Amino acid sequence: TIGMFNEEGENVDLYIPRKCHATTTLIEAHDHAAVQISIANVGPNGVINGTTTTLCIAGYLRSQGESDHAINHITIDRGIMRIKT
Amino acid sequence: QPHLRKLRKLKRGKPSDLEESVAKALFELEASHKTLRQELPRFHVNTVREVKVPRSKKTVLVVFYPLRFLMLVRKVQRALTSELEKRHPGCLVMLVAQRQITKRPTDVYKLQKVQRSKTSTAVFENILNDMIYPSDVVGRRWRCRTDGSKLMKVFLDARDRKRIESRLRAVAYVYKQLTHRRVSFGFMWNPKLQQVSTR
Amino acid sequence: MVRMHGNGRGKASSALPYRRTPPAWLKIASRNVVKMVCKSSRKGMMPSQIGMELRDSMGIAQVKNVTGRKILRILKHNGLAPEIPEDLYFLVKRATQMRKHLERHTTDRDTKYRLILVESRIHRLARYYKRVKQLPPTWKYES
Amino acid sequence: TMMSVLANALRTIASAERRGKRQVLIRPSSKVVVKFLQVMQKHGYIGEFEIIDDHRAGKIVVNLNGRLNKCGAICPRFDCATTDYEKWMKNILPSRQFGFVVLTTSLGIMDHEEARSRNTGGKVLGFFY
Amino acid sequence: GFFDADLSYPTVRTERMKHKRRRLVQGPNSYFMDVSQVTVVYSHATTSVECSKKLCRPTGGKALLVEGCGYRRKPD
RNA sequence: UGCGACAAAUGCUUUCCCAUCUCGGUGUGGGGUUUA
RNA sequence: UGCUGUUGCUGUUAAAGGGUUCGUAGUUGAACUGUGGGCU
Ligand SMILES: [Mg+2]
Ligand SMILES: [Mg+2]
Ligand SMILES: [Mg+2]
Ligand SMILES: [Mg+2]
Ligand SMILES: [Mg+2]
């Protein structure tokens, strides 16, 4: 579904780079500052259940110092983090 | 009969069942009410139309009157509106002035001579002001969704939410029956800083 | 004052409200408002000054929102408009006082420079008023 | 002074997209500007937007998804016949597979792909991709 | 923080600090007061207001009310 | 000159100074509207 | 030969912003009168 298809129906793309969740830009092969973070899911009893959720952050966002702010917004959207009191 | 004088001379012949009922009420009030007794003698209506709002119990009575009496009606609109409701239980009354619209010309030279108060933009705005008269508009926005539709929202002051809240469903439907345009309402506490109020 | 003829970039001005309906507590009929406007004109006030008297001491924020017409329109209907427009009148008065000062102080070169700017402003303004027929043709400014 | 309202608005949107903002405010508004936005909205390049009334030239707040690369105006508004479409596509578009040129025609405001199907010419307003 | 700022619905804290012509929709800053015969006085009056004596003094900003007469802000 | 009929985008049962002297309807037992 | 540049050049230091203003032809110039509706 993602990529370039010729009229013959085959996919003719070498690979599909990651698309950032915060900036919506493509993460290139020579970024070296882009990272992935895994946050564990904890069961009702209070221990981890063996599953995690993964986030990706483009390199330039970490250069401007806005990477921390982007993480806060994403976690709230996923319900990982609460707000107010 | 004297009460037929409250109608336009054309309709004095064979009035409809709604027309004379309003005429009797207007004639009776012109001699009884303290504040209406010096405005009513010069007043007469054009026609009365009945509208049934779907998914509702109350019905809406629309009264048309000539544009001459715009200032006359605005002076006593509050008392006149409430007085008519009592005589007609289970109904809502709105007073609307009858205005005409000149269609938008195609030629540039003709467009310069159009009387601006007869454009559809100006007329539809005044019709809305008639239906909510004791209240006024404090803001207006247009919402353009991705599907291509455009929805218009009108903000009223929150100070008079209690009075006019029950009537907004009727006003929205009647406004569509007269202009074929969609409207939606909201309330603003402190309209100066554009603060909307949720409940 | 700000942009034309100078480097000023000020922004000070008034901001009219979105709601154009007079308040409930204002109980003056439109006929009486028109009477007060015409009365102040015969006393000798200009349209700018008339609107400030009503604003300051009568509670009338905008004459148009009460009567439907602007102040200068009211004076024109009653035959009380000034012979020449108000802003052109004040610019001509300023240039006359500058010239009287300069005929004694002939070395005040800063004032001479300011006189050039004011007279250029007068000629631009006169050209506009002649095009819209608020001034007679062949009206001329005399130094 | 400000000579072109359309040119001012499009430059504001492109700048916000380059910096990665989520919303942008535009002033002054115009009926030509609104028509241009609806063309971009129809092809999915911008999200929902909203018009605020202030008894003057209004303001617009538009929501941006990350899909827009650049938009801009063409000044002066050159005339384009039906045979000139390939010339303009070749000059100001990244490729022949995506991107649009917006025109004003006697049939309304539309992108170059729709105008060709209707067999009409007009004047060039801008582009986006 | 943690609150997303919508451009079309600014918070009261943010909008309250803006210049009158930098708001989302511009508006006035002044108002009317009545004093006590009873007369109405503009908050930024610059001319002379008489009762029988002057009631306010002009100032670079808001007018200065004389001492010895009650005043009240009028609504709307 | 009189006459009949109908409109009116702005009230001639006008303006102007001349003078002379508790109930009902409504929404949820309470609220808000007109009136007393 | 994008070293004559409409498409499409350069002007802080390489060649190149007039000492500063006013100003007539000329070029350029803000918003607005406009969402048709109902049926299967
Ligand atoms: Mg070549
Ligand atoms: Mg070179
Ligand atoms: Mg050099
Ligand atoms: Mg220099
Ligand atoms: Mg224009």
XYZ file of C-alpha atoms (C1' of nucleotides) and ligand atoms in Angstrom:
713
model
C 0.000 0.000 0.000
C 2.913 2.307 0.828
C 5.494 3.026 -1.851
C 5.677 3.259 -5.621
C 4.035 0.571 -7.761
C 4.490 0.126 -11.485
C 1.525 -0.653 -13.717
C 2.484 -4.345 -13.589
C 1.398 -4.340 -9.927
C 4.774 -4.966 -8.294
C 6.356 -2.664 -5.726
C 9.491 -1.028 -7.118
C 10.677 0.795 -3.977
C 13.949 -0.116 -2.279
C 12.633 0.451 1.255
C 10.207 2.663 3.164
C 11.875 5.005 5.690
C 10.267 5.729 9.030
C 7.900 8.692 9.273
C 8.177 10.605 12.532
C 5.180 10.770 14.847
C 5.878 14.357 15.955
C 7.307 16.125 12.888
C 5.781 13.950 10.112
C 9.098 14.126 8.235
C 11.016 11.171 6.856
C 14.011 9.963 8.863
C 16.993 9.532 6.572
C 19.673 6.853 6.617
C 22.402 9.175 7.944
C 20.548 10.937 10.752
C 22.418 9.294 13.683
C 20.516 11.473 16.173
C 17.068 9.924 15.731
C 16.164 7.536 18.547
C 13.519 4.987 19.491
C 12.097 4.637 22.999
C 10.122 1.706 24.408
C 7.755 2.210 27.352
C 6.499 -0.842 29.214
C 2.804 -1.551 29.723
C 1.956 -2.327 33.354
C -0.951 -4.537 34.369
C -3.599 -3.691 36.963
C -1.721 -5.511 39.728
C 1.216 -3.145 39.253
C 3.781 -5.150 37.285
C 4.694 -5.246 33.612
C 2.788 -7.610 31.324
C 5.595 -8.147 28.812
C 4.505 -5.645 26.143
C 5.861 -2.208 25.257
C 4.963 0.740 23.047
C 7.517 2.348 20.733
C 8.069 5.987 19.746
C 10.347 7.561 17.141
C 11.802 11.077 17.220
C 13.618 12.734 14.328
C 17.133 14.015 14.866
C 16.584 17.717 14.228
C 13.880 17.912 16.895
C 16.499 16.828 19.430
C 18.856 19.544 18.195
C 16.415 22.382 18.880
C 15.771 21.099 22.394
C 12.077 20.468 21.712
C 12.296 16.667 21.956
C 11.156 16.704 25.586
C 8.077 18.770 24.724
C 7.095 16.430 21.887
C 7.299 13.395 24.180
C 4.883 14.975 26.663
C 2.198 15.527 24.028
C 2.522 12.047 22.525
C 2.243 10.202 25.844
C -0.956 12.067 26.727
C -2.532 11.186 23.376
C -1.809 7.504 24.046
C -3.230 7.735 27.563
C 0.139 6.860 29.092
C 0.262 10.153 31.009
C -2.464 12.061 32.841
C -2.972 15.828 33.214
C -4.144 18.333 35.870
C -4.538 16.638 39.287
C -65.951 44.520 12.458
C -63.425 46.915 14.001
C -60.760 44.289 14.697
C -60.238 43.669 10.975
C -58.591 47.102 10.785
C -55.437 45.471 12.196
C -54.954 43.672 8.858
C -53.764 44.910 5.495
C -56.604 46.197 3.340
C -56.108 43.385 0.827
C -56.832 40.673 3.399
C -59.822 42.335 5.078
C -62.123 40.420 2.728
C -61.623 36.725 3.539
C -59.152 36.398 6.419
C -57.696 33.003 7.213
C -58.416 31.304 10.526
C -55.029 32.360 11.900
C -55.230 35.966 10.707
C -58.362 37.087 12.541
C -57.399 35.320 15.770
C -54.259 37.451 15.925
C -56.306 40.470 14.840
C -58.703 40.072 17.765
C -55.795 39.813 20.199
C -54.124 42.923 18.787
C -57.381 44.876 18.876
C -58.156 43.823 22.452
C -54.646 44.703 23.630
C -54.714 48.129 21.965
C -57.327 49.250 24.514
C -56.228 47.310 27.625
C -52.432 47.211 27.896
C -50.766 50.226 29.480
C -47.727 50.521 27.202
C -49.179 49.061 24.001
C -52.111 51.482 23.856
C -50.158 54.317 22.203
C -48.163 52.271 19.668
C -50.774 49.761 18.485
C -53.274 52.218 16.877
C -50.868 52.886 13.984
C -49.923 49.218 13.515
C -51.237 46.443 11.275
C -49.825 43.129 10.104
C -49.426 41.569 6.651
C -49.990 37.847 7.215
C -49.432 35.064 9.730
C -47.859 31.717 8.854
C -47.707 28.460 10.810
C -44.553 26.332 11.019
C -44.283 22.880 12.611
C -40.793 22.196 13.954
C -39.935 18.476 13.739
C -39.026 16.516 16.865
C -40.736 19.069 19.099
C -44.033 19.741 20.838
C -44.428 23.511 20.545
C -45.286 25.125 17.213
C -44.117 28.459 15.817
C -46.291 31.393 14.754
C -44.616 33.775 12.297
C -46.078 37.266 11.891
C -45.181 39.484 8.932
C -45.527 43.265 9.058
C -44.453 46.101 6.748
C -40.952 47.503 7.070
C -42.394 50.943 7.879
C -43.112 49.878 11.454
C -39.626 48.552 12.222
C -38.931 51.171 14.883
C -42.505 50.909 16.155
C -42.213 47.157 16.707
C -38.726 47.296 18.223
C -39.982 49.651 20.926
C -42.624 47.257 22.275
C -41.391 43.898 21.005
C -40.826 42.406 24.462
C -44.315 43.143 25.781
C -46.031 42.329 22.487
C -44.308 38.956 22.146
C -45.119 37.728 25.652
C -48.702 38.999 25.475
C -49.486 37.024 22.323
C -48.084 33.811 23.815
C -50.670 33.725 26.604
C -53.568 33.955 24.152
C -52.078 31.062 22.134
C -50.906 28.250 24.430
C -48.461 25.721 23.054
C -47.123 28.110 20.413
C -44.180 30.456 19.917
C -44.481 33.821 18.174
C -41.855 35.688 16.162
C -42.280 39.085 14.506
C -40.491 39.435 11.167
C -40.469 42.461 8.883
C -41.094 41.803 5.196
C -38.082 42.784 3.076
C -37.288 42.400 -0.613
C -34.027 41.362 -2.262
C -32.538 42.535 -5.553
C -30.674 39.749 -7.317
C -26.960 40.286 -7.812
C -26.304 41.864 -11.231
C -23.756 40.522 -13.682
C -22.713 43.868 -15.173
C -20.209 46.037 -13.319
C -22.050 49.300 -13.964
C -25.321 47.959 -12.556
C -23.577 46.539 -9.484
C -22.496 50.027 -8.418
C -26.113 51.220 -8.187
C -27.507 48.454 -5.959
C -29.033 49.668 -2.707
C -26.890 47.882 -0.143
C -29.749 47.283 2.296
C -31.479 45.131 -0.347
C -28.649 42.623 -0.789
C -29.208 39.073 0.393
C -26.298 39.342 2.830
C -27.829 42.361 4.555
C -31.397 41.042 4.503
C -30.622 37.638 6.008
C -28.654 39.303 8.804
C -31.601 41.513 9.746
C -34.020 38.574 9.694
C -31.845 36.805 12.257
C -31.765 39.907 14.454
C -35.569 39.977 14.416
C -35.886 36.470 15.860
C -33.664 37.120 18.892
C -34.201 40.849 19.271
C -33.763 41.383 23.046
C -30.418 39.616 22.611
C -27.766 40.572 20.076
C -24.900 38.896 18.246
C -21.494 39.144 19.917
C -19.494 37.055 17.447
C -19.664 35.018 14.281
C -17.474 32.313 12.753
C -17.492 30.068 9.689
C -16.252 26.484 9.902
C -14.899 24.904 6.711
C -14.656 21.129 6.999
C -12.495 18.906 4.815
C -15.477 17.435 2.965
C -16.098 20.898 1.478
C -19.035 22.054 3.594
C -19.197 25.431 5.327
C -21.100 25.852 8.594
C -21.904 29.194 10.224
C -22.012 29.652 14.001
C -23.427 32.644 15.886
C -22.413 33.501 19.452
C -24.792 35.113 21.938
C -24.055 36.662 25.306
C -24.140 34.264 28.238
C -25.863 36.843 30.450
C -29.241 36.045 28.861
C -28.766 32.303 28.418
C -31.705 31.538 30.713
C -34.244 33.515 28.688
C -33.467 32.381 25.155
C -32.072 28.855 25.582
C -35.398 27.086 25.051
C -36.115 28.922 21.787
C -32.868 28.253 19.915
C -34.087 25.016 18.330
C -37.176 26.762 16.969
C -35.198 29.787 15.767
C -32.690 27.648 13.877
C -35.391 25.726 12.016
C -37.487 28.771 11.109
C -34.395 30.617 9.894
C -33.809 27.787 7.436
C -37.413 27.911 6.218
C -37.115 31.603 5.312
C -33.565 31.777 3.941
C -32.567 28.163 3.158
C -29.329 28.684 5.093
C -27.965 26.761 8.073
C -27.166 28.398 11.410
C -25.825 27.187 14.758
C -25.626 28.859 18.155
C -23.232 29.186 21.079
C -22.720 31.282 24.183
C -19.865 33.540 25.277
C -19.120 34.684 28.797
C -16.886 37.739 28.496
C -17.162 38.198 24.710
C -14.457 40.870 24.914
C -11.780 38.187 25.312
C -13.591 35.615 23.114
C -14.252 33.149 25.937
C -16.916 30.575 25.137
C -18.899 28.950 27.937
C -19.506 25.204 28.125
C -22.652 24.695 30.214
C 1.789 62.838 11.196
C 3.328 59.375 11.311
C 4.284 57.921 7.922
C 3.926 60.565 5.217
C 6.689 63.159 5.641
C 8.803 61.649 8.372
C 10.077 58.455 9.953
C 7.414 58.049 12.634
C 5.792 54.644 12.976
C 3.300 55.166 15.784
C 0.154 53.091 16.164
C -1.952 55.044 18.673
C -5.639 55.157 17.707
C -9.107 54.123 18.855
C -10.746 50.728 18.325
C -14.480 50.643 17.645
C -16.505 47.833 19.244
C -18.019 44.842 17.495
C -21.452 45.409 19.067
C -23.042 48.480 17.482
C -26.150 48.739 19.672
C -26.536 51.599 22.157
C -26.847 50.570 25.805
C -30.169 50.204 27.566
C -29.489 53.001 30.057
C -29.181 55.570 27.244
C -32.639 57.155 27.073
C -32.120 60.023 24.602
C -34.309 60.066 21.506
C -32.655 60.383 18.112
C -34.455 63.669 17.432
C -32.941 65.300 20.509
C -29.448 64.103 19.583
C -29.781 65.776 16.183
C -30.876 68.993 17.889
C -27.784 69.065 20.104
C -25.472 68.495 17.130
C -26.912 71.440 15.208
C -26.926 73.643 18.310
C -23.210 73.136 18.964
C -22.392 73.947 15.342
C -23.992 77.392 15.540
C -21.957 77.970 18.692
C -18.894 77.594 16.470
C -17.573 74.072 17.016
C -16.039 71.839 14.355
C -17.283 68.269 13.800
C -14.352 66.746 15.699
C -15.067 68.900 18.741
C -18.813 68.205 18.676
C -18.305 64.461 18.962
C -16.018 64.850 21.962
C -18.504 66.975 23.919
C -21.202 64.321 23.562
C -18.745 61.546 24.406
C -17.343 63.244 27.499
C -20.465 64.604 29.179
C -23.580 63.071 27.587
C -22.935 59.325 27.430
C -23.184 59.180 23.631
C -20.342 56.962 22.441
C -21.143 57.023 18.708
C -23.670 59.346 17.091
C -24.062 57.010 14.115
C -25.154 54.119 16.336
C -27.958 56.274 17.781
C -29.192 58.296 14.798
C -27.995 56.258 11.815
C -25.956 59.064 10.236
C -22.555 60.628 10.831
C -22.037 64.083 12.304
C -20.887 65.781 9.111
C -23.848 64.291 7.245
C -26.196 65.865 9.793
C -24.628 69.293 9.310
C -24.849 69.047 5.519
C -28.581 68.334 5.687
C -29.098 71.400 7.894
C -26.863 73.727 5.872
C -24.152 74.011 8.529
C -21.118 72.361 6.925
C -17.902 74.414 6.853
C -16.923 76.200 3.664
C -13.767 74.098 3.286
C -13.097 70.691 4.859
C -11.939 70.641 8.454
C -8.534 69.011 7.991
C -7.634 71.361 5.147
C -8.658 74.279 7.365
C -6.240 73.316 10.136
C -3.305 72.751 7.782
C -3.782 76.186 6.216
C -3.928 77.762 9.671
C -0.657 76.092 10.665
C 1.139 77.285 7.533
C -0.027 80.855 8.125
C 1.455 80.888 11.626
C 4.732 79.395 10.390
C 5.088 82.089 7.726
C 4.400 84.905 10.184
C 7.103 83.542 12.491
C 9.579 83.222 9.618
C 9.304 86.833 8.478
C 11.151 87.940 11.627
C 13.345 84.875 12.265
C 14.835 84.526 8.808
C 17.553 82.055 9.881
C 15.267 79.431 11.471
C 16.141 76.850 8.859
C 14.462 73.983 10.696
C 11.134 75.825 10.518
C 11.694 76.538 6.824
C 12.130 72.814 6.229
C 8.919 72.021 8.107
C 7.073 74.636 6.052
C 7.966 72.779 2.849
C 6.444 69.557 4.183
C 3.207 71.218 5.309
C 2.649 72.968 1.975
C 3.250 69.735 0.069
C 0.607 68.166 2.302
C -1.814 70.987 1.475
C -1.408 70.593 -2.287
C -1.963 66.837 -2.136
C -5.096 67.319 -0.046
C -6.505 70.056 -2.279
C -6.070 67.817 -5.318
C -8.157 65.074 -3.711
C -10.938 67.449 -2.672
C -11.203 68.944 -6.153
C -11.520 65.487 -7.715
C -14.493 64.580 -5.500
C -15.987 68.077 -5.915
C -15.788 69.179 -2.292
C -13.841 72.257 -3.438
C -14.491 74.621 -6.332
C -12.225 74.271 -9.345
C -9.580 77.014 -9.427
C -9.461 77.053 -5.636
C -5.866 77.948 -4.863
C -3.722 78.253 -1.764
C -1.938 81.593 -1.409
C 1.236 81.973 0.640
C 2.509 48.949 1.584
C 0.815 45.578 1.134
C 0.006 45.212 -2.554
C -1.187 41.594 -2.810
C -3.297 39.865 -0.177
C -2.948 36.447 -1.819
C 0.850 36.608 -1.970
C 1.015 37.615 1.690
C -1.205 34.740 2.821
C 0.575 31.965 0.923
C 4.008 33.037 2.146
C 2.718 32.851 5.716
C 1.507 29.272 5.238
C 4.707 28.056 3.587
C 6.829 29.551 6.365
C 4.781 27.854 9.088
C 5.026 24.489 7.334
C 8.799 24.807 6.982
C 9.099 25.379 10.739
C 6.682 22.547 11.507
C 3.923 24.469 13.259
C 0.491 22.933 13.782
C -1.665 26.028 13.222
C -1.139 29.387 11.554
C -3.089 32.647 11.619
C -3.659 34.650 8.436
C -4.678 38.284 8.019
C -6.166 40.043 6.138
C -8.621 37.601 4.542
C -10.264 37.720 1.130
C -12.705 35.714 -0.943
C -9.889 34.856 -3.355
C -7.806 33.491 -0.479
C -10.666 31.292 0.741
C -11.176 29.783 -2.715
C -7.467 28.967 -2.949
C -7.516 27.169 0.406
C -10.496 25.033 -0.587
C -8.602 23.770 -3.633
C -5.698 22.697 -1.422
C -8.112 21.235 1.121
C -9.896 19.139 -1.505
C -6.701 17.323 -2.500
C -5.767 16.721 1.141
C -2.851 19.118 1.586
C -4.342 21.094 4.494
C -6.774 20.217 7.241
C -9.780 22.039 8.611
C -9.779 25.835 8.700
C -11.979 28.526 10.195
C -12.957 32.107 9.336
C -13.413 34.715 12.074
C -15.562 37.787 11.463
C -14.600 41.197 12.826
C -16.620 43.678 10.696
C -13.445 44.282 8.661
C -11.198 42.129 6.519
C -11.401 38.992 8.624
C -8.849 36.442 9.812
C -8.324 32.740 9.143
C -6.939 29.995 11.388
C -5.923 26.888 9.444
C -4.834 23.491 10.756
C -1.825 21.925 9.044
C -1.070 18.275 8.593
C 2.487 17.542 7.620
C 1.837 16.917 3.931
C 2.505 20.360 2.436
C 5.974 21.036 1.028
C 5.589 24.494 -0.515
C 2.974 26.919 -1.779
C 3.426 30.252 -3.489
C 1.907 32.903 -5.703
C 2.767 33.871 -9.270
C 2.994 37.611 -9.905
C 2.019 39.096 -12.305
C -0.926 36.830 -13.152
C 0.098 35.705 -16.624
C -2.436 34.465 -19.157
C -2.481 30.739 -19.902
C -4.153 29.138 -22.900
C -5.023 25.451 -23.012
C -1.805 24.782 -24.942
C 0.410 26.374 -22.266
C -0.340 23.860 -19.506
C 2.664 21.675 -20.311
C 4.937 24.725 -20.271
C 3.900 25.749 -16.758
C 4.010 22.193 -15.420
C 7.544 21.833 -16.771
C 8.774 25.040 -15.116
C 7.330 25.299 -11.599
C 6.434 21.757 -10.641
C 8.687 19.089 -9.103
C 7.451 16.275 -11.346
C 4.671 15.165 -13.662
C 3.244 12.799 -11.034
C 2.123 15.230 -8.312
C 1.622 18.917 -7.676
C -0.898 21.402 -9.003
C -1.159 24.826 -10.612
C -4.169 26.930 -9.613
C -5.900 29.141 -12.177
C -8.740 31.643 -12.215
C -11.076 31.063 -15.156
C -14.500 32.253 -16.217
C -15.757 28.935 -14.809
C -14.263 29.683 -11.374
C -11.049 28.893 -9.522
C -9.644 25.416 -10.088
C -6.450 23.425 -10.480
C -4.848 22.856 -13.865
C -5.911 19.214 -14.095
C -9.608 20.047 -13.851
C -9.284 23.065 -16.146
C -7.800 20.924 -18.912
C -10.738 18.513 -18.726
C -13.173 21.426 -19.066
C -11.125 22.823 -21.986
C -10.716 26.340 -20.642
C -7.872 28.781 -20.137
C -7.338 31.596 -17.694
C -4.807 33.376 -15.519
C -2.255 31.731 -13.241
C -2.623 32.351 -9.502
C -0.170 30.031 -7.788
C 0.944 26.500 -7.061
C 1.313 23.983 -4.265
C 2.942 20.598 -3.779
C 2.242 23.334 30.819
C 0.855 20.198 29.118
C -2.009 22.289 27.663
C -2.253 22.643 23.893
C -2.886 26.270 22.940
C -5.569 26.641 20.274
C -5.156 29.783 18.192
C -8.903 30.267 17.738
C -9.740 29.780 21.448
C -7.014 31.451 23.508
C -6.978 31.149 27.275
C -8.111 34.051 29.429
C -4.645 34.418 30.957
C -3.013 34.845 27.550
C -5.666 37.043 25.945
C -5.947 39.417 28.909
C -2.387 40.706 28.458
C -2.675 41.745 24.814
C -2.798 45.225 23.337
C -6.330 46.256 22.417
C -5.565 46.038 18.678
C -3.655 42.753 18.987
C -6.558 40.680 20.301
C -8.270 38.081 18.150
C -11.061 40.642 17.705
C -10.198 44.231 18.585
C -12.324 46.277 20.949
C -12.459 49.291 23.251
C -10.735 49.869 26.574
C -12.923 52.640 28.007
C -16.274 52.760 29.798
C -18.826 55.161 31.269
C -19.437 56.173 34.879
C -22.161 58.165 36.590
C -21.467 60.530 39.468
C -23.541 62.144 42.190
C -27.807 66.112 40.063
C -26.328 63.064 38.304
C -24.207 63.110 35.148
C -22.402 60.548 33.001
C -18.629 60.852 32.611
C -16.341 59.167 30.094
C -13.464 57.241 31.642
C -10.886 58.902 29.361
C -12.405 62.376 29.176
C -10.128 65.176 27.998
C -12.504 68.152 27.987
C -13.892 69.951 31.034
C -16.968 68.415 32.673
C -19.200 70.576 34.869
C -21.859 69.613 37.406
C -21.718 73.409 40.052
C -17.990 72.777 39.573
C -15.555 70.711 37.533
C -15.813 66.982 38.230
C -12.712 65.559 36.527
C -9.230 66.640 35.526
C -7.702 65.656 32.173
C -4.656 63.405 32.197
C -2.395 61.636 29.729
C -4.466 58.521 30.394
C -7.640 58.019 32.410
C -9.357 61.096 33.792
C -8.919 61.959 37.464
C -12.096 62.112 39.534
C -12.525 64.816 42.148
C -12.773 63.795 45.793
C -16.182 64.260 47.372
C -18.624 62.728 44.891
C -19.546 59.073 44.537
C -19.116 57.313 41.213
C -20.275 54.015 39.742
C -19.392 52.161 36.554
C -22.274 51.707 34.144
C -22.824 48.292 32.533
C -22.187 47.280 28.934
C -62.072 69.740 -9.861
C -64.204 65.885 -7.424
C -64.484 59.603 -6.972
C -63.431 54.368 -6.134
C -59.355 50.524 -5.167
C -54.325 48.979 -3.687
C -49.189 49.847 -2.180
C -45.073 52.411 0.233
C -37.207 51.192 2.649
C -38.911 53.616 7.630
C -44.837 55.493 12.841
C -49.656 62.359 10.224
C -54.336 58.456 15.973
C -46.767 61.911 14.083
C -43.097 65.798 15.713
C -43.246 71.050 17.055
C -44.026 75.378 20.148
C -48.342 78.979 20.556
C -50.108 78.866 24.548
C -54.814 77.851 28.651
C -55.622 75.750 33.030
C -51.364 38.592 41.492
C -53.002 35.674 37.185
C -51.558 33.500 32.791
C -48.001 31.195 29.095
C -42.705 28.891 29.445
C -38.537 25.629 30.780
C -36.595 22.262 35.362
C -41.401 22.724 44.271
C -38.521 26.388 42.927
C -36.353 29.825 38.097
C -37.015 33.390 34.352
C -41.363 36.807 30.948
C -45.715 40.206 30.501
C -49.128 42.055 33.849
C -51.328 43.202 38.833
C 27.562 32.368 -21.975
C 22.580 32.277 -15.860
C 29.609 36.936 -19.120
C 22.969 41.289 -20.986
C 19.796 37.550 -16.991
C 11.231 38.304 -19.075
C 11.949 32.880 -17.944
C 17.266 33.868 -15.314
C 22.736 37.658 -13.008
C 25.382 40.916 -9.362
C 25.795 45.503 -5.861
C 28.971 44.768 3.285
C 34.674 43.519 1.911
C 35.730 41.116 -5.407
C 33.126 46.132 -10.431
C 28.657 48.414 -8.649
C 23.016 52.137 -3.578
C 22.619 58.428 -5.530
C 24.997 63.038 0.689
C 19.629 63.945 2.501
C 14.620 65.283 1.540
C 10.296 67.255 -1.564
C 8.099 66.145 -6.138
C 5.386 65.793 -11.950
C 4.717 62.252 -16.045
C 5.263 56.773 -15.338
C 4.770 51.885 -12.787
C 2.014 49.673 -8.518
C -2.211 49.872 -5.280
C -6.677 47.113 0.965
C -11.827 44.680 2.133
C -17.095 44.279 0.752
C -22.921 43.303 -2.873
C -22.284 35.693 -4.204
C -22.833 28.396 0.407
C -29.589 27.649 -4.143
C -33.153 24.358 -1.885
C -36.617 19.439 -1.652
C -37.310 14.178 -3.286
C -36.516 8.893 -3.825
Mg 21.995 28.532 -21.692
Mg 28.407 38.284 -12.976
Mg 34.069 47.918 -4.154
Mg 23.619 55.894 1.822
Mg -8.326 44.709 -4.971
